[PDB]
Amino acid sequence: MIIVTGGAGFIGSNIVKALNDKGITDILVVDNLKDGTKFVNLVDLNIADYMDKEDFLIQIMAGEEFGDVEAIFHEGACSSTTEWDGKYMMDNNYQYSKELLHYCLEREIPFLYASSAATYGGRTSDFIESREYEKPLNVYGYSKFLFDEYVRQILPEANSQIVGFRYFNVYGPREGHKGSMASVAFHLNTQLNNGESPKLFEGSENFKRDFVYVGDVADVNLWFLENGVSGIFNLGTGRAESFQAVADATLAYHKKGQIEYIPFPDKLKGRYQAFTQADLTNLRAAGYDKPFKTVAEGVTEYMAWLN
Amino acid sequence: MIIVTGGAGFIGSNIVKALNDKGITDILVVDNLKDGTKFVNLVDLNIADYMDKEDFLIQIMAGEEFGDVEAIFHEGACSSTTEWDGKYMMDNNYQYSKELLHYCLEREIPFLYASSAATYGGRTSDFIESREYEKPLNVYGYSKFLFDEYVRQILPEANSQIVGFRYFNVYGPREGHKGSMASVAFHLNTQLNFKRDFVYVGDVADVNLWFLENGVSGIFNLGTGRAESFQAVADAYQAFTQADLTNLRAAGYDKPFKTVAEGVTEYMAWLN
Amino acid sequence: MIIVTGGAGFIGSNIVKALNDKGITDILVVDNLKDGTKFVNLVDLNIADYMDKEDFLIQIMAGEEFGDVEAIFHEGACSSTTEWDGKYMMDNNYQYSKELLHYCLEREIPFLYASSAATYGGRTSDFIESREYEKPLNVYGYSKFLFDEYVRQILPEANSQIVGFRYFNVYGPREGHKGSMASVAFHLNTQLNNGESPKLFEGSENFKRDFVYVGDVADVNLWFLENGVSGIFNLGTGRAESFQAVADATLAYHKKGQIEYIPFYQAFTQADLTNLRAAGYDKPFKTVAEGVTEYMAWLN
Amino acid sequence: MIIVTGGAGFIGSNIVKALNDKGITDILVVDNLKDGTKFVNLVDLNIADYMDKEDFLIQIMAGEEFGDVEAIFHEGACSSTTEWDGKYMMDNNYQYSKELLHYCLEREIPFLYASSAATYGGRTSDFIESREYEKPLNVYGYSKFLFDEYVRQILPEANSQIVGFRYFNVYGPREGHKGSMASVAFHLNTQLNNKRDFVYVGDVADVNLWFLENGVSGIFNLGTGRAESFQAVADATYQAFTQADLTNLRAAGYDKPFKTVAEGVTEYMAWLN
Amino acid sequence: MIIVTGGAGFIGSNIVKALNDKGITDILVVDNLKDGTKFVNLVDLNIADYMDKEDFLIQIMAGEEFGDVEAIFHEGACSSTTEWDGKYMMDNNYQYSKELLHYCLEREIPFLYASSAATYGGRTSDFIESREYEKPLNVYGYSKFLFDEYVRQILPEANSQIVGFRYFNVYGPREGHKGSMASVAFHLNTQLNNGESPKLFEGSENFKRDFVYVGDVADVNLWFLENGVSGIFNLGTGRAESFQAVADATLAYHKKGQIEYIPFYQAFTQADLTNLRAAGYDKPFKTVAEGVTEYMAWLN
Numbered sequence A: 001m002i003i004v005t006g007g008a009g010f011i012g013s014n015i016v017k018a019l020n021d022k023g024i025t026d027i028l029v030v031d032n033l034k035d036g037t038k039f040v041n042l043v044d045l046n047i048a049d050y051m052d053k054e055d056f057l058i059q060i061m062a063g064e065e066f067g068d069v070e071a072i073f074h075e076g077a078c079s080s081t082t083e084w085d086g087k088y089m090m091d092n093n094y095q096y097s098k099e100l101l102h103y104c105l106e107r108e109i110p111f112l113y114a115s116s117a118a119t120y121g122g123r124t125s126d127f128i129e130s131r132e133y134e135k136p137l138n139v140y141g142y143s144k145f146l147f148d149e150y151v152r153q154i155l156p157e158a159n160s161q162i163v164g165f166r167y168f169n170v171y172g173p174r175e176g177h178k179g180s181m182a183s184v185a186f187h188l189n190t191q192l193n194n195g196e197s198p199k200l201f202e203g204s205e206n207f208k209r210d211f212v213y214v215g216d217v218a219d220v221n222l223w224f225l226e227n228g229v230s231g232i233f234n235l236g237t238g239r240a241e242s243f244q245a246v247a248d249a250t251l252a253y254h255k256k257g258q259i260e261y262i263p264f265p266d267k268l269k270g271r272y273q274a275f276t277q278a279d280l281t282n283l284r285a286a287g288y289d290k291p292f293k294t295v296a297e298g299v300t301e302y303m304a305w306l307n
Numbered sequence B: 001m002i003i004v005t006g007g008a009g010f011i012g013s014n015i016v017k018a019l020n021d022k023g024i025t026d027i028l029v030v031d032n033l034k035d036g037t038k039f040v041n042l043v044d045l046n047i048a049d050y051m052d053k054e055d056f057l058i059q060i061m062a063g064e065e066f067g068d069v070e071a072i073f074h075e076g077a078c079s080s081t082t083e084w085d086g087k088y089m090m091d092n093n094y095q096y097s098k099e100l101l102h103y104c105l106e107r108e109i110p111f112l113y114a115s116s117a118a119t120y121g122g123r124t125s126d127f128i129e130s131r132e133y134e135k136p137l138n139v140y141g142y143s144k145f146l147f148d149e150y151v152r153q154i155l156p157e158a159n160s161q162i163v164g165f166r167y168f169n170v171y172g173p174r175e176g177h178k179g180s181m182a183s184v185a186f187h188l189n190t191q192l193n194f195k196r197d198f199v200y201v202g203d204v205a206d207v208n209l210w211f212l213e214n215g216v217s218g219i220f221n222l223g224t225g226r227a228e229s230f231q232a233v234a235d236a237y238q239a240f241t242q243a244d245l246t247n248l249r250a251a252g253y254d255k256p257f258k259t260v261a262e263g264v265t266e267y268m269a270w271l272n
Numbered sequence C, E: 001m002i003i004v005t006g007g008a009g010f011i012g013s014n015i016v017k018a019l020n021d022k023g024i025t026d027i028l029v030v031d032n033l034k035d036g037t038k039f040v041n042l043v044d045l046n047i048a049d050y051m052d053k054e055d056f057l058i059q060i061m062a063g064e065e066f067g068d069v070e071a072i073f074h075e076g077a078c079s080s081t082t083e084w085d086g087k088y089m090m091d092n093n094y095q096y097s098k099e100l101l102h103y104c105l106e107r108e109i110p111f112l113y114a115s116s117a118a119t120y121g122g123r124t125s126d127f128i129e130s131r132e133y134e135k136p137l138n139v140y141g142y143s144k145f146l147f148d149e150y151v152r153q154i155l156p157e158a159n160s161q162i163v164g165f166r167y168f169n170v171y172g173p174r175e176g177h178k179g180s181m182a183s184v185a186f187h188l189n190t191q192l193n194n195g196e197s198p199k200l201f202e203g204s205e206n207f208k209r210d211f212v213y214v215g216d217v218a219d220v221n222l223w224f225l226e227n228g229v230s231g232i233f234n235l236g237t238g239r240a241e242s243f244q245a246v247a248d249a250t251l252a253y254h255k256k257g258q259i260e261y262i263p264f265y266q267a268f269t270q271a272d273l274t275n276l277r278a279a280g281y282d283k284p285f286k287t288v289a290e291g292v293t294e295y296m297a298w299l300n
Numbered sequence D: 001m002i003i004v005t006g007g008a009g010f011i012g013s014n015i016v017k018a019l020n021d022k023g024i025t026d027i028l029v030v031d032n033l034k035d036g037t038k039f040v041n042l043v044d045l046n047i048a049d050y051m052d053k054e055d056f057l058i059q060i061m062a063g064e065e066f067g068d069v070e071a072i073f074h075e076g077a078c079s080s081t082t083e084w085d086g087k088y089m090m091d092n093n094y095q096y097s098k099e100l101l102h103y104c105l106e107r108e109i110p111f112l113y114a115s116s117a118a119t120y121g122g123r124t125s126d127f128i129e130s131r132e133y134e135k136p137l138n139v140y141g142y143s144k145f146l147f148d149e150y151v152r153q154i155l156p157e158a159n160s161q162i163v164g165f166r167y168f169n170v171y172g173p174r175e176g177h178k179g180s181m182a183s184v185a186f187h188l189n190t191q192l193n194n195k196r197d198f199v200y201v202g203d204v205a206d207v208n209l210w211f212l213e214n215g216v217s218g219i220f221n222l223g224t225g226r227a228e229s230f231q232a233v234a235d236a237t238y239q240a241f242t243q244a245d246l247t248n249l250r251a252a253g254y255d256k257p258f259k260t261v262a263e264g265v266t267e268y269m270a271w272l273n
Ligand SMILES: NC(=O)c1ccc[n+]([C@@H]2O[C@H](COP(=O)([O-])OP(=O)(O)OC[C@H]3O[C@@H](n4cnc5c(N)ncnc54)[C@H](OP(=O)(O)O)[C@@H]3O)[C@@H](O)[C@H]2O)c1
Pocket: A005, A006, A007, A008, A009, A010, A011, A012, A030, A031, A032, A034, A038, A053, A074, A075, A076, A077, A078, A079, A092, A093, A096, A114, A115, A116, A117, A118, A166, A167, A168, A169, A170, A171, A175, A178
């Protein structure tokens, strides 16, 4: 079987779907279903079992076996860039990850986890997977940063696969539960569908990010499992587009819409990345030979799905 | 002895009553009496013992023996479609049932549990017990659906009886504690004081004991096979439901089900 | 040593008093003193030790020994007919009693507990100790009923004493902490002393109950311990008297007052003592007039 | 070392001070410092260590050793007469004390604890250390009473010292943290700055050390033996009437005199400045 | 491996930085990150691992091994002078410290901890490291004082290094999380940057403290680790400067600003460095002018 933590979440459920598409249905999903609405991410999919993240951690630490485990896609984490409880952050993200990494290392089970482009911090170019280029602006980013550092210590003598993917701005199907953390594209679609005005922060024409479609994120994940390469790789399209571009593509699909500019949130001031662009040199060097959908291509496919 | 989980609840207490009618009183009721008003479902009945759902799970997991257990009717669950705490939902419903299932499998104790027509979701026809017809609209429905999928993985090599009943719109005596989740017929009665497959609890209890006596395994729809309107109930989200009884009849259960008109008048003649 | 659970409570402290009255002082009282005012039921008494109901259960369940235990009078329970948390009710009353029962059975220690006439629910007549006559109206009544059914299954092969007493409307010393649940005699006394009108519900004549004096309740308990008989027995006088008769006896001692009848339920209870007498207990029971005058003397 | 429970409190800190005055500083103070202001009662004193009352009980019950313990002055307790949670009261006072008593009995460590005149309830005369004179008016008094009864059962066959002191109305230094529960003399002093048996703490501390040095066991009233009015306390700056009967105290051998209200209060007013 | 408790805090993160500057990156930081904004004190540094203070205590007390531990810099504590829950203070500060001291003593791991000048209380002169000079004014000062007294009992027969540093008025990079508890220099800088007025208490011209730069605090810490000397030492510059001088240096840097003396302890502090120099620590300490200007260049 394959274990997908964060399996009821955005990226996790898309990995489960990609596995289903490849004829794999022996899957254990580990998540936190407190917010029961997340179940829709799993309804049309096929899995073998479900376990809560707290029970799973207890069993992992107790050395329990879950069967013939072929890989663990660790997507589970608190992903809110605006969550400031650092005790919880380091516990749920950092410590939880180390616990799983060791469990897999002992049993030589491939470990593929989720890192974040938030690790780069206030950068304007050179988004390269190296400590000198890393300086997070929030605890969330720090929890991700510190685990990558921990993995870099472990890599030299690991006897099984360990891969971390620094996702950039992921968007696409199955993120409806994310609320305020859902992608801007999702937000714009609900605003337009509720008759409200589509909104963007003041400064969005100069605010650029590397938006990647989830479908591509799932594909990179499965490719790495099939190919066994280890390391920490940036996962983005390699091209930064403005938030305005995301809006343009979405408002084109809707045939209506006039963007309203909202004042920049105070809680984000000093904690925000105004520009991100993945450097795919290492990803390509690892052998990943597939293309990435553009914002225009990915956003129109997503909007068709949302409606 | 026979263990009935959810025994102080609607369907469970009706199963205890049906057992009492067949001269069986050596029954262990497992439930959650936080809402003490449910004790009335049990007052006029005869059971051997009562245990809280949390204590029972601790003992089940500890591998404790409860005596000469002849069967477990697992009716206990959070049956609210409006309950959105999925952590609790998956634990109380899904995980709890797996724990019980394994306990019974190891000891070859017949396991008869409660599924739900909510597994079908927004469906308009073809309510057949197969994964392609299932797509719940809420976590409650999901916890039920996922356990059915788990049982389907277990069925091929099980050495003892496993039966799940997909109840449709059950109504009848002993549901007063359900509040907003009580049947529309109950609501109308207390108020005065879309088509669904409405089934009388009496028939539900009968199907349960019939399967225990016949030992057949599987997942079966439990409804009348006839969809009637809420208006019909009054005269006496899934928008339309109607059980496909092909598998139930094929298992050998050929007995008829009371209509809304027959069941609702017998029910009012009880509530009053 | 004798263990009295509910010992800081109404009936339990009266059992401690009765034991003291014969010179017995080696007593372990188990209760819940969260409501500290209950300490008065114990100040004038003589006991060996005190333990909270939670710690006691933990020790019982762990199989600890408490010394030379000659009996356990289990009076401890939640007695509120208005308490609807059935999870607590079934745990504190039903489950706790089973735990104690088993502990005593394993060690052959006499077990005398408290049942309740609430098991009869809305019964009007024929208050006999048999399942056909039982149908409680609330969870409290149900927790008591079910434990009696459990004891009935255990009785046939028990090797030591098991006795349950279905108390009716008990009244007498040490029920002051019960508030609105205290006896009408207690309420009337408070009123007369506060200078208010002794109050009775409209048409209180014709409203009858089997009012029993706690002193007689305590005596039945000690008699059964001394005689070793097992079973479930009604504990009442066998005579139903009206609330009016209780008021009459109250003013007859107080030498004052004029009853005021307030506005607006069992209109009748009377214990059938056939089984109690058949078990061997034959002492008389104080009448309302006798018991109430004695009670008032203590209250004042 | 000497263990003083209630050591950051009124009477306890005074016992620590008395020990300091005799060259003893190897002291373990056990208290509850939730009210951090109680630290002042110990700033100017010399102790060896501090431990929270909860941790101490856990170690006592686990049978841990604390070093070479020569005595335990158990002053720690909830002393609020207006505190009605009897579950807490019986646990914190009654049960806690039994736990300590047994620990000391098994190791033959002298056990000197605090009782209370509240055990006499609303009494008017004959304050004598015997059960017939005791009838507390609140759970506080009851938790104290019942532990004295427990000690009386234990006394006949104890192989080490057990002493309980029935303190009457104590007043003096280190009670500032007590708030409304502080002595009337303390209250009057605060205000100006903006019949019962009153005993000075200094005397209370002295009696405590005397018994440890002399090893006598028993339960003894600790008061001056004379009842003075609150008016008297005022001039110098529910139990109605209290007056300790010192027959048993003198009989045990403690002959020393007690400061009167006028003497004790003027000395106290002096320290409070 | 070196363990730095309080590592995400002010002094602790500066010690981690000083370790990094000397090539040491194998560091375990133990802290409480509930206030997640403290992460910034660590983003630019290099450590080996992070652990919460509660989990660390459980492991310490369980006797767990953390690897090859060559020293523990115990800077973690509740540093609020206005915190009055003494149960917590004594637990988190005093007890937690004893727990760590014993763990280190058993394994002979050098233990360097943080004391406080608050142990002197309201003292005006003679800030010497001896009991006669100590008399704290709050529980925080008392928890620090009592641990120093405990260490003094332990010192005579210790077989490994134990050093405590009584820090005076520390100021410098990485204290932004402290809020109201941060240094006046920090405060003045945030105000000059909020376009508004720098506030100083009226009479600041005569409010003097031994202000010490964190950089020098970290240097003392590493020097003692390198030299293995034990004891309790004052950590200040030995010179008392006014709050006005602090302000002068700030405004000199900002090339602007006008001081508004707002309405409104320890009006004088000055470390006696006799024992510090006698231990062998001979380096000079930055003055307020030197330290404050360097601090401004960093804050901007
Ligand atoms: N644009 C993006 O989505 C993006 C960009 C960069 C990095 N990432 C990383 O990608 C991963 C998945 O992100 P997502 O967008 O798919 O998030 P998501 O929708 O929030 O899914 C993560 C799921 O995991 C649960 N969870 C939290 N901690 C867990 C744990 N320790 N073990 C198992 N489940 C846990 C969460 O529930 P609770 O949180 O309620 O417990 C949530 O349902 C995370 O590690 C995130 O940091 C995402």
